Symmetry: D2
Subunit: 326 residues, 4 copies
């Protein structure tokens, strides 16, 4: 059988995506570097290359210069390897060790961390290398924003571990953090050279744009991963949550996710309506920040279909037809 | 003395404007063509070139191919020459003749119009040349759109005449039509090759986006033309209406216009919040249409400053906000 | 080791422009060829990693998406087709190699049947490319495509005879066998460039195509350490035998040949007459196509580990 | 004759579609009103300068100069234009001592003992100083010296021009001598230095001085001279000028106007031949240097292609109708 999936390419997702022309040069530099850093064999490095996090980063900040794009690729490799420790690895059912990993990773960011090496701790090494470059070209305010957005991610990782070993709104709240879109937006502020002032960034409208970006990524992933989750019999996902809540069929559940996607767009514009002008000079950067929020979600969407992340090399037919066979 | 003009480059006006790369080639064609058609002397042709309607058109549809950008330039020359007849020229206080001009110009678009030549009626000739091009690459539906949006403009011209020979809301209502923003959006649909289906176009959100575009052009023009209006003693403008109605200083009135500009941005986003999705394929072109609405207003703004339309040194009013009087 | 010559000098030293439609075209064409050819998962993944889309995307960087997909289909075709003669069932079978060429030629306006993926997958792909080529190309450009493919098919048959059955003979065979000439035809389609035949046939432009083919041959020879496979039918071997040279000395002579290509390029262009602005505008685009086919092959060779697994060989110079 | 058929000036390396810097509009807005303020241009002279549109010219020389560097370029073009007129038609035209003193004081701006000028105290020198300040701030010593040396090549030829003007000898009849003085006074060599700054191109001196790259610069200068000679013929006739390539060729070989124009056409196409022959002799210096060499070669091409398109666009020689000369190849004569 099948479900008719919601069109995920509507409204602000419907425009032609722009990809960083430095994609090829950065992919060559960053895929081999992380392979060297992590001791990837020939197979693992090729699998990672296929995953192509460079494509994702290249849509988040399409005019980042090559060196910043490489840092963004390094960060995406970090996130991917870091996050795995909590979802599937040695921290998955260990709240005390998870909290300590978070504590030591935070300490990298201007705290009392040692100088790591690839050999002493390869994952923390990558994060430290990203932080060095971040802190070299960012104001103190920017540096603190990067710290604070990563802490929003780390905080929900710890909530997740507590739930692992130890409601749609509660699910979305958790995913908002764990999906990693908030620090991804900080990373893109760095790649694109955008520095919205903190008091403007803190406006509820811009905070809602970030929320919308994180929700769109969560919702798209929950749609596209359904076949895979069904194959491997998982339970911790929004489809299963909606089906179990009211005994919805898969089709009825996916339709509800379609409603939430379309409500993201409504929230987006209603937030922008409430966002005051701060004058041309600041507004110029506010619109670039708004574009970063959109591009993180649209990048996730195109990258998911491009790389066969959830639907294999033939998942593009889901895009064209709207049918996701099971 | 002076007034501090409100920032006109906030919000959706604050982005870096994209300009058609065909600007130079289209300008080299269309400027000397209109000078020939209109018999412009060397000095009048030079002034028209300065006015640089090509720059304006080049921001309305920045990826229009050269031949369509040319048409766009011809249309901009047409509408400036056409409109002058009603604002300042022989139709200004003649309702009967104004109605006949509209009737004859409407007949060009698939009606019973004769074939005009540059020698028989140069202004109608330009419009006919534009219509011929428009028809040749547009669906029947897009031809009728073009017709209907031009009629929204013509209708307010006839209203204006009646008043010429004869309320902020009524002021904005009339300007919305006479500013020519609605047919300019139809022109840009042609130039950019964007054909949103009529049932989507007619959605109130997209109609509100066009109205916001037209309001923005009206309000920007009223702000920037204040010094010129004071010099000439112009009295039928938004600044005089606001000062008269609410007993405001010039600074207080200019600031009210700035409030109205900012309310345009709020209306814009509130409209888009209500805009339904029609699926990716249509939505792709809807977003291009929305950008056309934005670009027509941003084009007017940058063109006003670039060409010294109202202020000559006007870039310093941009930088400081100070409009000396 | 050998210090390989700098292959990124002169007209190869510019920053490469890659078609922005790369991602969309790769998504369509890679899965399409896997289905046509019944690739298993591992073979399809290997093919995507080979990334012929990147190659095509540098040949014609402003091709629209549909044309780029056409170019990607063609590149998969030539890769599969050429392997039938270099290692497949036609490698030492002149009678069958001649029959394959005949049936492939017949696709291009001849008596060929309507192929399907089921009856003959490789012939089906080539037939799908020819249909698209013929739909948007003048009769003159159609004939040029046919004729450049025959310069390719001919050297294939010569190659098979030298299997069953002089640097200049080596280069002349390679020029025909590498496929640079039909790739230039493909790029004329992708880019929408239609130089008149009498200008195309001028010796200067023919030399520009010859220079492009030689550059591709020479870069392949240099990059292909792989030849730890025991092979001997290559340029390095021919130069070490003939002149009693070490590998380093031989590699250095190939670098001299590469730099001689660039001198030939400019000497050819010095002789190219003007046909007026209108035509010259498209001639300059055709010259860029010739340059881009060679530059595309160079960057693709390095980007995909095709020969070296290599971006360090680029930076440090094997 | 009532007309001549002019050669196709848009062939070969001039046939490409020119790329124009997207910062054109913002740079022009800044630079035109700045120069008008520096030079106290009245309303009409400022509008005339805007029309002349040296920004369009600079925007084709270095089409991806960032806005601030394009602004400098525009400033320099305005400087050159006003500076050069002093020697061609102004107060230095027949004054070898004043001309030498101006050159000395302008050379002193470039790291010598010049004072800090203001728009009030010497506006033309002030502009050159503001340009030099920005040039030096982002250029190595070697590139500073190259800019100085190329400006000195232009200044030297200006001094030769003034010496010839007061010496009262007959207009030359030696094409070689004609072309050599024009190459020097046209200002193409310092324009290439400016574009090396506008485009951030840094060819090392030993490569720059290779005869192939010097010939690319020479071809660029010759093309600008030859295009100017063809396009200005009508206005030269109108104004009665006799010191130009058309008259030299007609006098020397007893040619009609059409035959003389045809020879200039031959000279333009020989420029293209020389260009490629020079490139054939240019060595490779490895990827990193050759990358800059290819951009430098493009600068040489774009300075000449920019002159051609700008001349037509702005009506410099033929008015807004000169585009028809391009379209038809026919130039009508008074």
């Amino acid at each position: 059988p099948f479900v008719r999936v919601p069109d995920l390419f509507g409204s602000i997702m419907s425009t032609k995506p722009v990809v960083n022309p430095n994609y090829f040069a950065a992919k060559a530099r960053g895929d081999r570097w992380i392979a060297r850093v992590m001791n990837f064999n020939k197979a693992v490095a090729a699998r990672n290359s296929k995953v192509d996090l460079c494509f994702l980063a290249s849509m988040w900040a399409p005019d980042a210069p090559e060196d910043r794009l490489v840092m963004m690729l390094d960060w995406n490799h970090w996130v991917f390897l870091f996050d795995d420790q909590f979802d599937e690895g040695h921290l998955k059912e260990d709240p005390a060790a998870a909290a300590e990993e978070v504590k030591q990773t935070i300490a990298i960011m201007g705290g009392n961390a040692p100088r790591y090496t690839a050999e002493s701790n390869p994952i923390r090494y990558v994060f430290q290398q990203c932080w060095d470059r971040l802190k070299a070209v960012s104001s103190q305010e920017m540096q603190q924003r990067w710290i604070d957005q990563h802490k929003r991610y780390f905080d929900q990782l710890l909530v997740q571990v507590d739930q692992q070993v130890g409601d749609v709104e509660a699910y979305m709240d958790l995913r908002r953090g764990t999906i990693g879109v908030y620090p991804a937006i900080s990373l893109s502020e760095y790649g694109a050279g955008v520095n919205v002032p903190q008091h403007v960034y803190d406006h509820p409208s811009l905070q809602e744009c970030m929320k919308v970006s994180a929700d769109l990524v969560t919702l798209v992933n929950d749609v596209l991963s359904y076949r895979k989750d069904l194959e491997l019999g998982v339970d911790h996902n929004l489809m299963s949550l909606l089906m179990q809540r009211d005994n919805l069929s898969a089709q009825q559940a996916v339709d509800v996710i379609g409603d939430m996607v379309n409500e993201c767009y409504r929230r987006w514009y209603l937030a922008l309506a409430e966002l005051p002008s701060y004058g041309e000079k600041i507004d110029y950067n506010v619109m670039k920040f708004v574009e970063i929020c959109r591009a993180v979600a649209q990048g996730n969407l195109y990258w998911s279909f491009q790389t066969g992340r959830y639907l294999g090399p033939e998942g593009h037919e889901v895009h064209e037809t709207g049918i996701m066979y099971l």
